[model samples]
Target chain A: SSLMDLPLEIHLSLLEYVPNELRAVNKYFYVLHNHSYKEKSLAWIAEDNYIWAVVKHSLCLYVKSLDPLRQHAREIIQETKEPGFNVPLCMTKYIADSWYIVYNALQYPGKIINMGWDKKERTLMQSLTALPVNFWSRKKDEPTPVNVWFYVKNAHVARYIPKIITEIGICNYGPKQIVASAGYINELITSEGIYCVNLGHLPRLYDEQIFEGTGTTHLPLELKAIDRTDSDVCINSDLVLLGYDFIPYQISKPWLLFRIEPVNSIEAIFNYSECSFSYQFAWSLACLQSEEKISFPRDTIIKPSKLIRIFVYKHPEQKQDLGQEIALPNWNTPYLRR
Target chain B: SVLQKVIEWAEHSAPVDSWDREFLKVDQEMLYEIILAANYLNIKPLLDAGCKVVAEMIRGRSPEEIRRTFNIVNDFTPEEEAAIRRENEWAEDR
Candidate 1:
């Protein structure tokens, strides 16, 4: 049988040995690596509790950082108008909890501003204490938050939130020509600079299927609210959120990818791509209960652990040996500076 | 000699065996056939050895040398090839 005729398991086993760079050599190997091996594995892994734990950990870090911002944002809201109800106390829980949801409104700022006044049921931050629980339960038909939040705090705080208030502000009041620039809007949507949190309501009606294509959604205004919140005050273009999104985790190497799996409390899997090595250590969630934010663990010993699975394809030695014997560089190997 | 060892190992079970100098000395057609066989049989070690040998053949060689070694047709237009080379020039050593 030819290589193309191999069974699925055989294709995977064979392709595992093929260096990652060589997979880009031609369409045959490319599809085998990307579609057959990586994509399939990624989809499967994404469904697992292990992957969800990692995702939840990231979201928790984001929410923790928002506490300071939410406290300040609450005062800003109270200053706006006279409230009939116990304003500060009534808003305290919602502001802290729903900053996760409120953050998504930045997706289409101009449109959200022009849509003019959130309807009673569409208040941004009402009743959000259950977000983490609701999201984790994976109830059938419940809307999942799109992976619009920047996964790490550094990128989220330093770049994303700033661009939203600035660019969208200009886009809101600027001339029609500037508003009509599809290129600019496309850049806004796709840029890693900003991640659009999906608050419960949009200015227009949209189906969840919008997320299935291009990791982007385009919405037209005029469709009334599909979801509702408890607050009576309508949010208008005058709304300005105070306080900054901060990164709580003290990073050693900011780019190093981390994975967490529960052992007793947790296990920290750290990949140092520069050295082409991985290390893991026992991590405890006990620090989270303290006043200070939980920092990512460091000081690891080099040893084999199931929690840290290195993708052998990324190892330079796998390709390097083939070339050194012949006094040459591996042409199929991508020459990336660590 | 390594291809013989590969066949012997394939006859037993599909556990990966080590690569050796003998694995690197083979004709192009035979090497290609060995890769195809390893892929078909799901022998990871053999496939890795075969691909490494193929990589060694094209190592320190130009893109044209690679296409020539593999009997690959130049599908890209001259403009496209030039553009790709220019784009990738940042990675190349002087």
Candidate 2:
């Protein structure tokens, strides 16, 4: 068989030797290098985050548990800090920003569930000790009511399955709407739930949705949308729907947890270039059972890994196609600064 | 088989200095065959040693030297080669 005929593991093995060379050789090698590096970074958390800190200045102080990895990474950083390094500043910045996204995902896996920013309310919801409640902002144009989209990306969540779910309270900011679904079926049924308020013109809020399943088959199920005013969705604190049999549901890797995007351009406040936003998303979930005994494999700890490669211009110029093809810097290179 | 042989050659459990030395003495084609086999078998130490030998063959040498030693044809036109060089030039000074 040809070299390319080898299994992916072999390509990965070779990549660790001359990552830069193999990455530059051909498209096939490049793709192999991409996957290999991604798996490597995720498998090696300390090194991954140290490289992450190298990219994000804000995270430099906060990133902890970096010793052996730091020693090696520091060598690379020092090499770059040496004078006469010709690499462009933008390239270094781009590399760091890329790692920042990975770092963020690992740092806050469960916090990814859409709970909009209302500190006092969030704490109050948890204080009720009745359920785990979260709040999220809504866009007029998108899946606003409380659209929750989730996917299972890893191994099966054995044993423990969610039984009949009940009254899930949803709160929203405006005359809200709600739609929910999971992998094949659309228009999922939520049993016996209602809106607590429907004030005319004052922007009716506080709509709650009931989610109930036959609880007959142990089908792998995910969640969906609810809309209300300045809202939070509350489920019983003792509930454990997302958990696996033994290990808690850590946000399953490589899956987009929850997303918030403006529903329509008409209700949107500004044009694309004028407005920017950050959506709340989680990389993994750890909420299996509120009180169930749990243990996690060492690898279960989320590790920073490459997810996407993006290019941005340092200076936006006129008619310059903002798209001049920019190649990513050699990721295997020693350091960023020198 | 092939995977086992590569692993056997890696010198992990015991030091086989002569075997490693003899292994690197293979011709370019045979060396690459071993690399390909090692890569296919997921033998990391073997792949690493093989690549290192290949790398050593051209260390501190010019691109022309590498191309000549590897018998690589100059398929890239002057302009294309220049563009490639320009792209990598930033990393060269360091």
Candidate 3:
């Protein structure tokens, strides 16, 4: 039935089903997502950058609810002075953005049938898993401190899965991409996922290497396209995906692992200069510039009590090319170890 | 004219999956329609491309220059405008 066809109470009941938390989150995400169609909403609202402000609000509210989680984040923020610091917005924005995308899609799905509950179940779990937990300190040379953005980098390598199952992977960074199905399983069972390191957590060593991956000095014209060029002159050579994952562990001392269905072909190699960064990679979703670094103020910080498993693409025989398909394995395994 | 061209680029170049190469093949008027269609479709990438195109033009313009360019009126009161001028002080180089 059309809009008028539905009974008023039924419509009201439908609106009631939407939780208050989500309704407020939706108001922010929609305008932030796009203001052209949302001009009416923005016009009625009493804020500029309505979406971003709401995101901050949501994060603050979310942080407050997390108790110790809020404490750790606050400690980091107090020490670093980097909240709302720089571009690629904050990691909180990513979490907010991910939830916003998944959750709001459920409310009023435009044309595209918003993949609901089943998909959202996974997304919500991933969003909860990917919540911001660490604060990074500033470099000795830099003036201000910035928060260290943390996320659940999904290690879904498609090559490992058998032909019967068709799920895509995200965050194709290191060796996982290059190794064979046999190698990936070994990784999954022996050392990847929650059990990635023998140590309880990944030590956020107090080293001063800015993960922003930038540098100076472009070489002679001939070296313009060298592999693994610095992040300074080139775009992101590696692709990062925005994802939700069910990381298994103490949930407190969580370890990151995920099952991702690739939106694009997983066979493509990481190219820093190409549009591939902005297209499929999570990190580049905001058209993030290499120069934008949000610095935190303090030295001591609260870092993740977990290890990350990065899955890369590797097919020795196949040419390194985009839009290519690899053979899916025929076998099924009993269990995927964390 | 540049704004029109920017809009054209955004209309055709957005939601950049492999499927919509057809949108790019069309002309100026079609591109405008495509942008409107993309906005209607709630295609974020397309909308961003269009807005970003506008943002790019406004990137380095001064308030006076922007006012002249957009033919917009200075709607602030003298006191309000003075405060705005003070805010602009940081933007101006010696």
Which candidate leads the pack in TM-score?
1
DockQ ranking from best candidate downward: 1, 2, 3
Better of 1 and 3 by DockQ: 1
Writing each residue's lDDT as its tens digit, candidate 2 over A1-338 gives: 13444456545655554444443444455445434534544554443233233223322222222222222222222222211135432223322222322232232211112221112122211100011111121222111122122221111221101111111221111232322222322112112111011011111123323213311100111222222212223232221122111001111111112111212121111111101111111101122222322132211111221112121212334222213212322221212110
Better of 2 and 3 by DockQ: 2
**TM-scores, in order shown?**
0.27, 0.27, 0.21
Cα displacement (angstroms), candidate 2, residue A153, comes to 61
Alpha-carbon local distance difference test for all models:
0.29, 0.29, 0.25
Say which candidate scores most in DockQ: 1
Please give, as one word, the docking class of candidate 3: incorrect
List runs of model 1 lying over 4 Å from the truth. Answer: A1-33, A36-338, B1-19, B36-44, B59-62, B77-94
lDDT of 1 at B33: 68
Q: Score the docking of each candidate (DockQ).
A: 0.06, 0.02, 0.01
- Candidate 1 structure quality by residue, lDDT tens digits, A171-264: 1111211011112222223222212222221111223443354322221111112112132212331221111111111111111111122231
Candidate 3, residue B59: the lDDT equals: 47
Q: List, residue by residue over A230-308, the lDDT tens digit for candidate 3.
A: 2221122121222211112222222222222333222111111111111212222111323333121111101111122
